[PDB]
Design a protein around this ligand. Structure first.
Ligand code: MG
Ligand code: MG
Ligand code: MG
Ligand code: MG
Ligand code: MG
Ligand code: MG
Ligand code: MG
Ligand code: MG
Ligand code: MG
Ligand code: MG
Ligand code: MG
Ligand code: MG
Ligand code: MG
Ligand code: MG
Ligand code: MG
Ligand code: MG
Ligand code: MG
Ligand code: MG
Ligand code: MG
Ligand code: MG
Ligand code: MG
Ligand code: MG
Ligand code: MG
Ligand code: MG
Ligand code: MG
Ligand code: MG
Ligand code: MG
Ligand code: MG
Ligand code: MG
Ligand code: MG
Ligand code: MG
Ligand code: MG
Ligand code: MG
Ligand code: MG
Ligand code: MG
Ligand code: MG
Ligand code: MG
Ligand code: MG
Ligand code: MG
Ligand code: MG
Ligand code: MG
Ligand code: MG
Ligand code: MG
Ligand code: MG
Ligand code: MG
Ligand code: MG
Ligand code: MG
Ligand code: MG
Ligand code: MG
Ligand code: MG
Ligand code: MG
Ligand code: MG
Ligand code: MG
Ligand code: MG
Ligand code: MG
Ligand code: MG
Ligand code: MG
Ligand code: MG
Ligand code: MG
Ligand code: MG
Ligand code: MG
Ligand code: MG
Ligand code: MG
Ligand code: MG
Ligand code: MG
Ligand code: MG
Ligand code: MG
Ligand code: MG
Ligand code: MG
Ligand code: MG
Ligand code: MG
Ligand code: MG
Ligand code: MG
Ligand code: MG
Ligand code: MG
Ligand code: MG
Ligand code: MG
Ligand code: MG
Ligand code: MG
Ligand code: MG
Ligand code: MG
Ligand code: MG
Ligand code: MG
Ligand code: MG
Ligand code: MG
Ligand code: MG
Ligand code: MG
Ligand code: MG
Ligand code: MG
Ligand code: MG
Ligand code: MG
Ligand code: MG
Ligand code: MG
Ligand code: MG
Ligand code: MG
Ligand code: MG
Ligand code: MG
Ligand code: MG
Ligand code: MG
Ligand code: MG
Ligand code: MG
Ligand code: MG
Ligand code: MG
Ligand code: MG
Ligand code: MG
Ligand code: MG
Ligand code: MG
Ligand code: MG
Ligand code: MG
Ligand code: MG
Ligand code: MG
Ligand code: MG
Ligand code: MG
Ligand code: MG
Ligand code: MG
Ligand code: MG
Ligand code: MG
Ligand code: MG
Ligand code: MG
Ligand code: MG
Ligand code: MG
Ligand code: MG
Ligand code: MG
Ligand code: MG
Ligand code: MG
Ligand code: MG
Ligand code: MG
Ligand code: MG
Ligand code: MG
Ligand code: MG
Ligand code: MG
Ligand code: MG
Ligand code: MG
Ligand code: MG
Ligand code: MG
Ligand code: MG
Ligand code: MG
Ligand code: MG
Ligand code: MG
Ligand code: MG
Ligand code: MG
Ligand code: MG
Ligand code: MG
Ligand code: MG
Ligand code: MG
Ligand code: MG
Ligand code: MG
Ligand code: MG
Ligand code: MG
Ligand code: MG
Ligand code: MG
Ligand code: MG
Ligand code: MG
Ligand code: MG
Ligand code: MG
Ligand code: MG
Ligand code: MG
Ligand code: MG
Ligand code: MG
Ligand code: MG
Ligand code: MG
Ligand code: MG
Ligand code: MG
Ligand code: MG
Ligand code: MG
Ligand code: MG
Ligand code: MG
Ligand code: MG
Ligand code: MG
Ligand code: MG
Ligand code: MG
Ligand code: MG
Ligand code: MG
Ligand code: MG
Ligand code: MG
Ligand code: MG
Ligand code: MG
Ligand code: MG
Ligand code: MG
Ligand code: MG
Ligand code: MG
Ligand code: MG
Ligand code: MG
Ligand code: MG
Ligand code: MG
Ligand code: MG
Ligand code: MG
Ligand code: MG
Ligand code: MG
Ligand code: MG
Ligand code: MG
Ligand code: MG
Ligand code: MG
Ligand code: MG
Ligand code: MG
Ligand code: MG
Ligand code: MG
Ligand code: MG
Ligand code: MG
Ligand code: MG
Ligand code: MG
Ligand code: MG
Ligand code: MG
Ligand code: MG
Ligand code: MG
Ligand code: MG
Ligand code: MG
Ligand code: MG
Ligand code: MG
Ligand code: MG
Ligand code: MG
Ligand code: MG
Ligand code: MG
Ligand code: MG
Ligand code: MG
Ligand code: MG
Ligand code: MG
Ligand code: MG
Ligand code: MG
Ligand code: MG
Ligand code: MG
Ligand code: MG
Ligand code: ZN
Lengths: 107, 97, 70, 95
RNA sequence: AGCCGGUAGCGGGCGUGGAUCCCUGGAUGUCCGAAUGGGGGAACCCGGCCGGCGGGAACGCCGGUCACCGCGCGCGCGGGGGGAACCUGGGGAACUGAAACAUCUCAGUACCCAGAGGAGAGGAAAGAGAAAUCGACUCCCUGAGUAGCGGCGAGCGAAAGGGGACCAGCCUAAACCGUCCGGCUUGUCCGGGCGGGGUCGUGGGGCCCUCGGACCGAAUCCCCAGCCUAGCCGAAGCUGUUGGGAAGCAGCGCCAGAGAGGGUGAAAGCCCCGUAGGCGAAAGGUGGGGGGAUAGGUGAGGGUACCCGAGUACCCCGUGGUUCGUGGAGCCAUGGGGGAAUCUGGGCGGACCACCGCCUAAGGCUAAGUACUCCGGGUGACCGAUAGCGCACCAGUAC
RNA sequence: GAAUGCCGGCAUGAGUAACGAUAAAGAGGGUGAGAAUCCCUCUCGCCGUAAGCCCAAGGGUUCCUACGCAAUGGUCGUCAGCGUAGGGUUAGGCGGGACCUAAGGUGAAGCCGAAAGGCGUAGCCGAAGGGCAGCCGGUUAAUAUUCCGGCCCUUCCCGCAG
RNA sequence: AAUCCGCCUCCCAACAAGCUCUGCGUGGUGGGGAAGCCCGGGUGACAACCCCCCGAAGCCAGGGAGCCAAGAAAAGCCUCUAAGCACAACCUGCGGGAACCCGUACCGCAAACCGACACAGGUGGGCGGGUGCAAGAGCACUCAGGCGCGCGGGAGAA
C-alpha cells in the first residue's frame, strides 16, 4: 500500500555504514521507490555535463547520490543520539515517531 | 416421429440384435449374436382433431393416450374458453393435465 | 487546484440550482476551449490549467447529477 | 452535458487553413462523430457568426512507432465553415 | 510525507487546512457484443413516439422509450448470454485389445448438445436379503479382484455386511367439508379455482358415534457474534580493524512467547523489511455459530368400508440398466399391443408354485459429509531461462 | 558420439554460381566526406491497342515537403515506395446509404426434427440490374464534377396565386 | 370500389397532324488558346478561332427487319377509386427557407493488387492519335505521354 520509511525529509540522520559512515546530515530528499534517501554533503559523485545552456563551460558538477534508507539512522532532537524509531500514540490520538533511547519526539 | 403432447413419450434408442443358432432350451448349442446395431423406437403418434368451445383443436398424441385427449375436453366444461384462440385453448387443456 | 479551492468549489456548487450549474458548466467548457486554443498555438505555459478546468467541470456535473438524482 | 465547445476542439493550424480566412472559410478540428448541421450551430453559438456552408472530411490517424511498438495516432475530423458575407471570426484571424 | 502510472524530460502544478496511495460505497460510463426499435459485412447505418435545443417547419443534435418468448389478471414478473475444471441429463465413435476377426474390448470413454450451481447428482424404502436381521441418501476404507459375467477367449466385475465422514427430514393427491366461478341436460348435477382436512406400513387417512384439551419447532425471516474485502503495534550493539564496502576478524555488551525468512556495498538475532505475540472496520460481502420471531407440529378406543397417485400395475412383444453377452433370467427402466384393483388392495425375496417373511409403485422437495480450481494464500529432498507454463521480457504477440 | 535425432552457433562448397528479360547507352554541368548509379542539359536507343491515359477491385499513407542514409534496395547511393517530422483527401447534383427489387439469404403464419437444429407463401435483407438532380474552366507542393468562377438543375418544408 | 384498365358496339381520326420526350445544332454568357525564345511561369496574343472532306461499335432509341432457342423483378412515374376528407387535400406556377451520413490522398497490367522477393507469371471496364501496307484493335515507324528494365568495366578461348 505504501513503502515504510523510518526517516523523512528533513530530519537529522547518522549515516551508519558505507564510505561515509559516521557522517551526520539533514535529509534533503526521500525516494520511497528506490527505498533511498539523499543526505546533505554525503555520497558526493562527479558527474559529467555537456557544454549546454544549463552548463556553459561544461566540465563536471557534484551531486549527492542516493543512500539505501537502511544505512541511515535519525538523530534524536532531545538526547542528541542516533536511535531506532518507535511509534507512540498521543491523546490526539495521532501517532508519532519517538526516540528509542530516551522518549523524545522525532516528528 | 416425435413427442406425445399428452404423455411426453419420445423416440427411444434400442439395439436391433440379430441372432443365429438353436437355443439351449431346445437342445441346441446356443444362440450366437451375428450383429447389434442402434435403431429407434417411435411412439405411435397420431393426430387427434377435437372441437372445443367452437374452435378446432388438434393434438399430436401417442395412440395409448388418445382417450386422454377426450378426458381433457370433458374436464374443460368448467372453463371460460369462449372467445379464445385455438392456441390458448390448447394451453388451457394441457394445463388440466 | 489547491485542496482549499476544491473544497470551496464544491460548497458553492452544492448551493447552486441545477439551472445555475448548467450555465456554469457551459461557461467553463467555453473557457476550456479557449485554453485548448492557446495550448494549440503554444501560448499556454501554465498547462496545468487545462487538467484543472476539466476536473472542475467533472465536479460541477457530479453535483448537477447529485441534485437531479432525488 | 453537450455544448458547442464539445464539438469544436481546436483550430487547424496550417498554410492551407490560413489561406481560407481571406474569403471567410474557417477550418476546425471537430469531434469525429459531429454532424454538418451540428457544427453549424456550434460555430454559430461559440463565435457569434452566421454559417452559410459547412464542409467536412475525416482525417485518418498516421501509423507511428517508438522502437518496437507499432501504433496509430487518433483519427480526426475537420470542418470548413463558411461565415456570412462580411462576417469574421476574430479568434482565428489571430493569426 | 510526499505526489502528478510504467517515465526520465520539457513546460507547469499539488500536499500536515492531510495530497499521491490502499479498501468500501456511489457517480459518470461513447460504440459493439445475449444485444433486444429496425437493418447490418460486430464496433456501422436507418427509424416510430414523447420531451428539449437552433431562426427551426424541412435538417440535425440531446434525454426518455420501442425486440421476442414464457408465466400471471395494456400492465406486471421471469427468460435469453457467459464461466477454468467439476456435475447431471439427451446423444455417442474409432484406433486399440482379443497377437487375424465379426460377438466381446476399448467405453457409455473421446466428442456433440441441453441444463445446473457454488457445487451438481442422490435422498426418507412398493429398499435390502436370510441376519428370527437392517433402516433415507451421498462419500472414503473394507468386503474383493470375492460372487459371478465371458467367442467361459481376451477380458469384464458387483452387492449385502463391517469400519468411518456427515446426519434431517418434510410438502402434497384422493376420501370428506366450505366457498366462489360456468356449463346446461336444472340439480342432493357435472366441471374449474381457492381454503380447510390429510400424508401413512405396529397400515394410514376420511366420516359417524364415544372418553381425554401445554409442550415441540424450522431448511423461512430478524438481530448478533465470528469471517472476508484496507491496515497497525512489535524486543535488543557499540567500538576497533582489513576492505570500495563489514554484516568478516577482534573487544566488550544486549534481546529472545521474536535465532522463519528477505534486504542493506561482503557473511547482521540487536541497521532495514519482518518474525513471536498482539491490535483493527464507518462501508460492502458473508454468517453453517449464538439469540429471537414465524410457518408447521400433537389423543384413545369402537363402528363405517368412503379414500389411499391409470393408459399405471399386470401379461405379452422389442430393448436398455445390473456382475448377468438368452442364460434356469428374476429385478429396475420402457417403444408397441392388451389392460386391473384400493388394503379381503398391491410390488419384492433370481423361472415357476406353495408356505413364510419384507415393502407400500404409478406427485414433489430436502442441508451436511462428496467433486473441481478461473481466483487469493501457504508450503516444497519442485524448475532455474534449451529448464519451469506456449509466455520470467509488451505472447496467445511476431509470424 | 551417433537416433537422415532436437535447439542454437559456426564451418565446407567459394571469393565460386548468381546479381531476375539482349529496349542501350555517351558526354558536359551541378551537389556532396564520397557519385557509372542523385539533379540539370545535349546526344543515342526502346514502347506507343502501350511499356501512354482514365475507372473498378484489392492495398492502406505507399501521396506532398523538409531533414536523413544504419538497415531495406540483389552493386552504389548524396536517391527512394526506406528512417524522422510537418502537411495533404472539402460534394444536395460523382459513388453508396436515408429508394427498388434479382438469384440467394432471412423469415410473421405454418410445418418438421432426440438436443443442436432443418424447412417455410408473405414480409424483410440482398446489385456492378432498375431508379435519381452538373457541365466547362481556374486554383494547391499535395484535393477538386467536391474549393472558386460562370451558367444550369433536384428534392423536402412553408407561404401565395390559380 | 372505380369515371381507370379489359371486352363489345357506334362515330371522327389515321405511313398526317397534334400532344409529349430525347438527341444534335444554334444560343445571352463564361472560358481556353500553339510553335518559338525567354528565368512550372512570362511572352507570343486584342491570338485566330473559318471552309472542305472522312466518320463510328457512340447518340436520337423504348428505331426498323428477320429468326427461334421465344428473351427478370420491384420501386420511382401515371391513372383509378376505398375508408376518410372535402375551412382539408392534391395538381400547376412562383417565392423564400431547408438539404444528413460514409468514400474522395496515392498505387492500380503493377516495385504499392495475387504470386515468401522491387518475382519475365496472374488481374475486370473505358480512351487508345498519325502514315503506309486491300481491311483491321494486324504489321512497321512515329505523336502525346512514358521508359532504357537498381551492378558495372574490359576481353573477343573452348
Ligand atoms: Mg506505517
Ligand atoms: Mg558498518
Ligand atoms: Mg565512526
Ligand atoms: Mg489519523
Ligand atoms: Mg429388431
Ligand atoms: Mg435357451
Ligand atoms: Mg435340459
Ligand atoms: Mg451367446
Ligand atoms: Mg402421423
Ligand atoms: Mg384421428
Ligand atoms: Mg403402450
Ligand atoms: Mg392401448
Ligand atoms: Mg479531486
Ligand atoms: Mg455525460
Ligand atoms: Mg498553399
Ligand atoms: Mg445542434
Ligand atoms: Mg464528404
Ligand atoms: Mg494514440
Ligand atoms: Mg507520463
Ligand atoms: Mg521541468
Ligand atoms: Mg482522515
Ligand atoms: Mg469504485
Ligand atoms: Mg459522445
Ligand atoms: Mg450496446
Ligand atoms: Mg440493435
Ligand atoms: Mg437483426
Ligand atoms: Mg420533436
Ligand atoms: Mg443559426
Ligand atoms: Mg425543431
Ligand atoms: Mg434521440
Ligand atoms: Mg430514438
Ligand atoms: Mg437457452
Ligand atoms: Mg447460465
Ligand atoms: Mg449420459
Ligand atoms: Mg433433453
Ligand atoms: Mg446414451
Ligand atoms: Mg454424456
Ligand atoms: Mg456415429
Ligand atoms: Mg472395434
Ligand atoms: Mg489403444
Ligand atoms: Mg487396451
Ligand atoms: Mg492385451
Ligand atoms: Mg486385434
Ligand atoms: Mg494383434
Ligand atoms: Mg487386421
Ligand atoms: Mg476390433
Ligand atoms: Mg461398454
Ligand atoms: Mg473429458
Ligand atoms: Mg449455460
Ligand atoms: Mg461444499
Ligand atoms: Mg439438488
Ligand atoms: Mg415418502
Ligand atoms: Mg476375504
Ligand atoms: Mg463395461
Ligand atoms: Mg454399505
Ligand atoms: Mg456402514
Ligand atoms: Mg472429515
Ligand atoms: Mg439418519
Ligand atoms: Mg351457478
Ligand atoms: Mg370436479
Ligand atoms: Mg363442487
Ligand atoms: Mg370446489
Ligand atoms: Mg383404518
Ligand atoms: Mg421446511
Ligand atoms: Mg514495526
Ligand atoms: Mg526491530
Ligand atoms: Mg576486499
Ligand atoms: Mg579504510
Ligand atoms: Mg562495524
Ligand atoms: Mg563478534
Ligand atoms: Mg521461529
Ligand atoms: Mg535468517
Ligand atoms: Mg536473512
Ligand atoms: Mg556468518
Ligand atoms: Mg551462508
Ligand atoms: Mg539479517
Ligand atoms: Mg501471528
Ligand atoms: Mg502479526
Ligand atoms: Mg395424526
Ligand atoms: Mg380413531
Ligand atoms: Mg373402499
Ligand atoms: Mg401409493
Ligand atoms: Mg396423473
Ligand atoms: Mg420386458
Ligand atoms: Mg446389458
Ligand atoms: Mg439383459
Ligand atoms: Mg449361462
Ligand atoms: Mg437378468
Ligand atoms: Mg417373483
Ligand atoms: Mg416391467
Ligand atoms: Mg411399454
Ligand atoms: Mg396386504
Ligand atoms: Mg392381492
Ligand atoms: Mg414391480
Ligand atoms: Mg414382476
Ligand atoms: Mg426383496
Ligand atoms: Mg426365491
Ligand atoms: Mg403371502
Ligand atoms: Mg422389501
Ligand atoms: Mg431431486
Ligand atoms: Mg446442516
Ligand atoms: Mg447442496
Ligand atoms: Mg454437499
Ligand atoms: Mg478442494
Ligand atoms: Mg494458486
Ligand atoms: Mg536446481
Ligand atoms: Mg535456486
Ligand atoms: Mg533464454
Ligand atoms: Mg521457455
Ligand atoms: Mg545462461
Ligand atoms: Mg515450457
Ligand atoms: Mg503465467
Ligand atoms: Mg517455449
Ligand atoms: Mg520464450
Ligand atoms: Mg515480442
Ligand atoms: Mg553409442
Ligand atoms: Mg546428414
Ligand atoms: Mg542432415
Ligand atoms: Mg548423407
Ligand atoms: Mg540433427
Ligand atoms: Mg547431437
Ligand atoms: Mg536439428
Ligand atoms: Mg544446424
Ligand atoms: Mg574450416
Ligand atoms: Mg561460408
Ligand atoms: Mg576469381
Ligand atoms: Mg568450383
Ligand atoms: Mg567459373
Ligand atoms: Mg559470372
Ligand atoms: Mg539471365
Ligand atoms: Mg538484366
Ligand atoms: Mg556527371
Ligand atoms: Mg561532375
Ligand atoms: Mg553514384
Ligand atoms: Mg557515392
Ligand atoms: Mg537526372
Ligand atoms: Mg520504335
Ligand atoms: Mg498507333
Ligand atoms: Mg478503396
Ligand atoms: Mg499489402
Ligand atoms: Mg510509413
Ligand atoms: Mg496527392
Ligand atoms: Mg510519405
Ligand atoms: Mg514520392
Ligand atoms: Mg532531400
Ligand atoms: Mg542506406
Ligand atoms: Mg548505404
Ligand atoms: Mg552507408
Ligand atoms: Mg540514425
Ligand atoms: Mg540492401
Ligand atoms: Mg546497399
Ligand atoms: Mg532483390
Ligand atoms: Mg547528404
Ligand atoms: Mg524505394
Ligand atoms: Mg518517407
Ligand atoms: Mg509542409
Ligand atoms: Mg456543388
Ligand atoms: Mg445517394
Ligand atoms: Mg431522412
Ligand atoms: Mg434499403
Ligand atoms: Mg426491399
Ligand atoms: Mg414459429
Ligand atoms: Mg432457415
Ligand atoms: Mg424464400
Ligand atoms: Mg424497405
Ligand atoms: Mg435494398
Ligand atoms: Mg443500385
Ligand atoms: Mg445503377
Ligand atoms: Mg446520381
Ligand atoms: Mg449541366
Ligand atoms: Mg494527384
Ligand atoms: Mg491538394
Ligand atoms: Mg460550384
Ligand atoms: Mg388555393
Ligand atoms: Mg369490382
Ligand atoms: Mg361507363
Ligand atoms: Mg379516358
Ligand atoms: Mg444543345
Ligand atoms: Mg437548345
Ligand atoms: Mg474570348
Ligand atoms: Mg495561352
Ligand atoms: Mg510557351
Ligand atoms: Mg496580354
Ligand atoms: Mg504585342
Ligand atoms: Mg492580332
Ligand atoms: Mg461492331
Ligand atoms: Mg425494337
Ligand atoms: Mg422451338
Ligand atoms: Mg419478384
Ligand atoms: Mg415493396
Ligand atoms: Mg365516406
Ligand atoms: Mg388534375
Ligand atoms: Mg426552389
Ligand atoms: Mg440520418
Ligand atoms: Mg464524410
Ligand atoms: Mg479526390
Ligand atoms: Mg484522384
Ligand atoms: Mg492520381
Ligand atoms: Mg509505379
Ligand atoms: Mg494512375
Ligand atoms: Mg500482362
Ligand atoms: Mg484493363
Ligand atoms: Mg501504370
Ligand atoms: Mg508488396
Ligand atoms: Mg509483390
Ligand atoms: Mg528490379
Ligand atoms: Mg511483375
Ligand atoms: Mg486480361
Ligand atoms: Mg484521340
Ligand atoms: Mg489507313
Ligand atoms: Mg501488309
Ligand atoms: Mg493489310
Ligand atoms: Mg492504326
Ligand atoms: Mg497478329
Ligand atoms: Mg502491334
Ligand atoms: Mg515488333
Ligand atoms: Mg507521327
Ligand atoms: Mg519524348
Ligand atoms: Mg538496360
Ligand atoms: Mg538489371
Ligand atoms: Mg543501367
Ligand atoms: Mg576473355
Ligand atoms: Zn532521545
Amino acid at each position: 500500500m505504501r513503502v515504510k520509511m523510518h526517516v523523512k525529509k528533513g530530519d537529522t540522520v547518522l549515516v551508519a555504514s558505507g564510505k561515509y559512515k559516521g557522517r551526520v546530515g539533514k535529509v534533503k530528499e526521500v525516494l520511497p521507490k528506490k527505498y533511498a534517501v539523499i543526505v546533505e554533503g554525503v555520497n558526493i559523485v562527479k558527474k559529467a555535463v555537456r557544454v549546454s545552456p544549463k552548463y556553459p563551460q561544461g566540465g563536471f558538477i557534484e551531486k549527492e547520490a542516493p543512500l539505501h534508507a537502511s544505512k541511515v539512522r535519525p538523530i534524536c532532537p532531545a538526547c542528541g543520539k542516533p536511535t531506532r524509531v518507535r511509534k507512540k500514540f498521543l491523546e490526539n490520538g495521532k501517532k508519532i515517531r519517538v526516540c528509542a533511547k530516551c522518549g523524545g519526539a522525532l516528528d | 416421429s416425435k413427442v406425445c403432447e399428452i404423455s411426453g413419450k419420445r423416440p427411444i434408442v434400442a439395439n436391433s440384435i440379430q441372432r443365429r443358432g438353436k437355443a439351449k432350451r431346445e437342445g441346441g448349442v446356443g444362440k450366437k449374436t451375428t450383429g447389434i446395431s442402434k435403431r429407434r423406437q417411435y411412439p405411435n403418434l397420431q393426430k387427434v382433431r377435437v372441437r372445443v368451445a367452437g374452435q378446432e383443436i388438434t393434438f399430436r398424441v401417442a395412440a395409448s393416450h388418445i382417450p386422454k385427449v377426450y378426458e381433457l375436453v370433458e374436464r374443460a366444461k368448467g372453463l371460460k374458453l369462449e372467445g379464445l384462440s385455438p392456441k390458448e385453448i390448447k394451453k388451457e387443456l394441457l394445463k388440466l393435465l | 487546484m489547491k485542496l482549499s479551492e476544491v473544497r470551496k468549489q464544491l460548497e458553492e456548487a452544492r448551493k447552486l440550482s441545477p439551472v445555475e450549474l448548467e450555465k456554469l458548466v457551459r461557461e467553463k467548457k467555453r473557457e476550456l476551449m479557449e485554453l485548448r486554443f492557446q495550448a494549440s498555438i503554444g501560448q499556454l505555459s501554465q498547462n496545468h490549467k487545462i487538467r484543472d478546468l476539466k476536473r472542475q467541470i467533472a465536479r460541477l456535473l457530479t453535483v448537477l447529477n447529485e441534485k437531479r438524482r432525488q | 452535458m453537450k455544448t458547442a465547445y464539445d464539438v469544436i476542439l481546436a483550430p487547424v493550424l496550417s498554410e492551407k487553413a490560413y489561406a481560407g480566412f481571406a474569403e471567410g472559410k474557417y477550418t476546425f478540428w471537430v469531434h469525429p462523430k459531429a454532424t454538418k448541421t451540428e457544427i453549424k450551430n456550434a460555430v454559430e453559438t461559440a463565435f457569434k457568426v452566421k454559417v452559410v456552408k459547412v464542409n467536412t472530411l475525416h482525417v485518418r490517424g498516421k501509423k507511428k512507432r517508438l522502437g518496437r511498438y507499432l501504433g496509430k495516432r487518433p483519427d480526426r475530423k475537420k470542418a470548413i465553415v463558411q461565415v456570412a458575407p462580411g462576417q469574421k471570426i476574430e479568434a482565428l484571424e489571430g493569426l
